[PDB]
Amino acid sequence: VTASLDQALVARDWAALQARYYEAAVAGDELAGVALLERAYRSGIPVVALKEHVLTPVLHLIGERWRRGELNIWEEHLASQVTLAATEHLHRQLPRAPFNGRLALCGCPEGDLHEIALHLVMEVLEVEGWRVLSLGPNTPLFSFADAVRRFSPQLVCISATIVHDLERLRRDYGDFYHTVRQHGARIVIGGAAFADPQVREIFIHDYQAAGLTDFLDYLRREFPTPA
Amino acid sequence: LDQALVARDWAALQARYYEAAVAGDELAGVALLERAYRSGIPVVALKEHVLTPVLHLIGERWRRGELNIWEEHLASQVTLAATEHLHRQLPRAPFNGRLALCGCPEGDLHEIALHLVMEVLEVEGWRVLSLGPNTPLFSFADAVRRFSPQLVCISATIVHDLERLRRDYGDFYHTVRQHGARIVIGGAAFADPQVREIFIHDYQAAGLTDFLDYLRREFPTP
Numbered sequence: 001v002t003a004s005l006d007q008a009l010v011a012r013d014w015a016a017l018q019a020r021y022y023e024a025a026v027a028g029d030e031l032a033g034v035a036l037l038e039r040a041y042r043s044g045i046p047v048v049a050l051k052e053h054v055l056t057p058v059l060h061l062i063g064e065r066w067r068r069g070e071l072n073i074w075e076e077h078l079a080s081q082v083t084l085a086a087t088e089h090l091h092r093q094l095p096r097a098p099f100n101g102r103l104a105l106c107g108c109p110e111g112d113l114h115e116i117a118l119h120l121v122m123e124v125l126e127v128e129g130w131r132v133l134s135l136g137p138n139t140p141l142f143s144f145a146d147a148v149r150r151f152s153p154q155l156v157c158i159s160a161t162i163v164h165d166l167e168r169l170r171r172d173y174g175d176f177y178h179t180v181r182q183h184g185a186r187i188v189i190g191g192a193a194f195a196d197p198q199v200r201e202i203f204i205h206d207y208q209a210a211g212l213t214d215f216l217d218y219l220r221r222e223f224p225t226p227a
Numbered sequence: 228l229d230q231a232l233v234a235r236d237w238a239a240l241q242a243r244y245y246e247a248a249v250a251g252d253e254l255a256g257v258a259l260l261e262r263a264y265r266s267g268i269p270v271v272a273l274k275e276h277v278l279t280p281v282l283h284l285i286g287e288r289w290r291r292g293e294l295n296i297w298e299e300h301l302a303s304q305v306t307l308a309a310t311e312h313l314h315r316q317l318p319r320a321p322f323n324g325r326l327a328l329c330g331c332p333e334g335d336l337h338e339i340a341l342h343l344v345m346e347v348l349e350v351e352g353w354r355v356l357s358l359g360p361n362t363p364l365f366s367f368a369d370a371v372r373r374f375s376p377q378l379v380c381i382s383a384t385i386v387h388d389l390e391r392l393r394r395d396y397g398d399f400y401h402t403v404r405q406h407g408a409r410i411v412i413g414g415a416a417f418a419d420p421q422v423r424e425i426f427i428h429d430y431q432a433a434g435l436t437d438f439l440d441y442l443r444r445e446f447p448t449p
């Protein structure tokens with residue numbers, strides 16, 4: 001009955017894909033979720049475009065609906081678990097560039113619990129042949145700085161959805177930024193928190209990304225690999 | 228190393244896991260656990276006598292200033308990733324028709340134990356719906372109305388919102404029973420008698436092993 005899925009894939013009909021991924025996610029259906037993704041990859045849709053044009057829009061909408069009272073916590077929570085599990089499930093299957101000798105250190109700021117974008121980012125990095133160290137969400141800047149001293153990474157990525165602690169962050173940034181520079185590493189930020197110009201001001205950065213596509217453009221210019 | 232496996236020298240194994248975890252080295256972490264399993268040690272044993280102790284110690288040392296946040300964060304991601312990786316490489320019982328609904332309470336972010344349990348369930352052939360950590364009690368009930376689970380599992384490490392949970396628990400319990408579900412609780416939060424009192428339950432688990440003993444008595448393998 002359902003080869004109409006396969007017509008959504010061919011047309012690149014993002015809306016229908018979103019709708020079906022949604023139905024799987026809010027229902028806690030890990031397998032239906034991975035299947036939809038798996039099938040769209042082997043149909044030749046790139047992972048990044050799945051991520052930017054199926055997963056991200058769906059989660060935004062889940063949040064818009066939750067806010068308007070059309071959707072409840074339990075449905076987001078299942079969608080969140082499904083998406084974390086399904087993205088990893090797919091990623092373990094993907095081919096990867098050779099190890100590029102480089103180390104990325106990644107996490108989200110203290111008090112922020114939203115970490116799916118972080119996961120999408122770390123995955124992309126691995127596919128490009130980076131070693132990744134995840135501090136995960138809810139990470140103080142001093143903790144970032146400690147880990148930069150310990151590992152001397154080449155890149156620090158921060159995903160930030162929710163930032164309120166402006167004065168603490170203004171204050172810890174100096175030490176963080178100087179540890180980064182002394183180690184010769186670069187800083188890339190993304191996430192909704194940086195729509196606020198005060199937050200963006202604090203988080204002195206080498207590159208602010210809108211999404212994964214332009215992040216990749218940045219990686220290719222800033223950290224090019226031979227062939 | 229293979230010496231430590233043969234001897235079953237938990238201490239040596241604990242120490243190597245810790246070294247891998249605080250270094251943020253997922254591959255070494257999985258390697259150790261995988262080698263250990265294939266040297267004859269059940270995964271449950273690895274969970275209880277390697278992962279749990281290493282993580283309780285990370286906490287202790289953090290408290291005493293001997294270990295910093297950055298090192299715990301790394302160990303927690305290593306553990307989440309490592310335990311999932313091993314799980315996917317394990318034999319499972321066939322589906323048993325039964326559904327477990329799993330979560331941690333609202334405002335609690337400690338979620339590794341929940342993963343450890345959910346895994347154990349799937350290996351026993353259960354299907355598992357994960358609400359994840361930081362699940363309001365009413366949000367558990369919402370989900371019991373749908374799905375109609377046979378089991379609800381709750382891991383709790385941090386619980387302080389006593390007056391709310393006290394007043395929300397009535398409806399959640401009603402809903403559980405009128406769907407014939409069972410409630411299993413575990414984790415450090417239930418060492419507090421006021422918390423345990425609110426969380427009317429069918430079994431309280433000390434760890435994973437006795438959890439299995441309870442599942443086999445009450446959910447006899449078809």
Ligand code: B12
Binds near residue numbers: 113188
């Ligand atoms: C799922 C979710 C949660 C889950 C997350 C589970 C988890 N483990 O991650 C949980 C339950 C924790 C949660 C909690 C809350 N959240 Co919430 N929820 C979301 C939701 C629905 C989806 C988040 C998500 O995964 N987005 C997916 C990513 C991929 O989208 P994205 O962040 O836009 O990322 C893209 C780009 O920004 C970029 N990018 C992002 N980061 C980075 C980093 C780098 C380095 C680069 C290069 C690129 C990059 O690439 C991505 C793809 O192109 C959003 C809705 C939304 N708009 O996202 C809210 C939302 C962010 N949550 C919100 C709120 C209010 C809450 C709570 C305060 C609710 C409450 N308790 O009362 C709490 C706060 C907890 C905290 N302190 O962080 C609000 C925030 C609104 C606001 N800013 O005022 C939102 C917007 C929902 C809403 N519309 O109201 N939430």
Ligand code: B12
Binds near residue numbers: 283284287384432
């Ligand atoms: C990692 C960790 C964190 C991480 C969690 C990462 C993650 N995503 O899971 C983060 C950073 C989020 C964290 C934060 C905090 N936590 Co913390 N941290 C821990 C730590 C070190 C490990 C947790 C863990 O994975 N334990 C290992 C598990 C597998 O062991 P277990 O819970 O004993 O589970 C066993 C049994 O209980 C049973 N079980 C457990 N649950 C269930 C459920 C069911 C259904 C069943 C059948 C069985 C079962 O199975 C296991 C047997 O193998 C503990 C230390 C510790 N003692 O556990 C603290 C600890 C719990 N944290 C603590 C504190 C103080 C905090 C913070 C307040 C710190 C802060 N100021 O910010 C915050 C609070 C956040 C919150 N609201 O939840 C304290 C709590 C002390 C107390 N109760 O007062 C601890 C004990 C550390 C300490 N020594 O002081 N923490």
Ligand SMILES: C[C@H]1O[C@@H](n2cnc3c(N)ncnc32)[C@H](O)[C@@H]1O
Binds near residue numbers: 361362
């Ligand atoms: C932004 C996301 O946060 C979740 N959310 C909203 N309020 C709570 C709460 N009290 N406890 C847990 N999660 C909550 C919703 O599911 C929403 O989609």
Ligand SMILES: C[C@H]1O[C@@H](n2cnc3c(N)ncnc32)[C@H](O)[C@@H]1O
Binds near residue numbers: 110289297
């Ligand atoms: C219980 C665990 O909580 C972590 N922890 C303690 N304080 C913070 C904080 N401000 N931000 C994030 N994690 C923290 C520590 O790593 C400890 O081991």
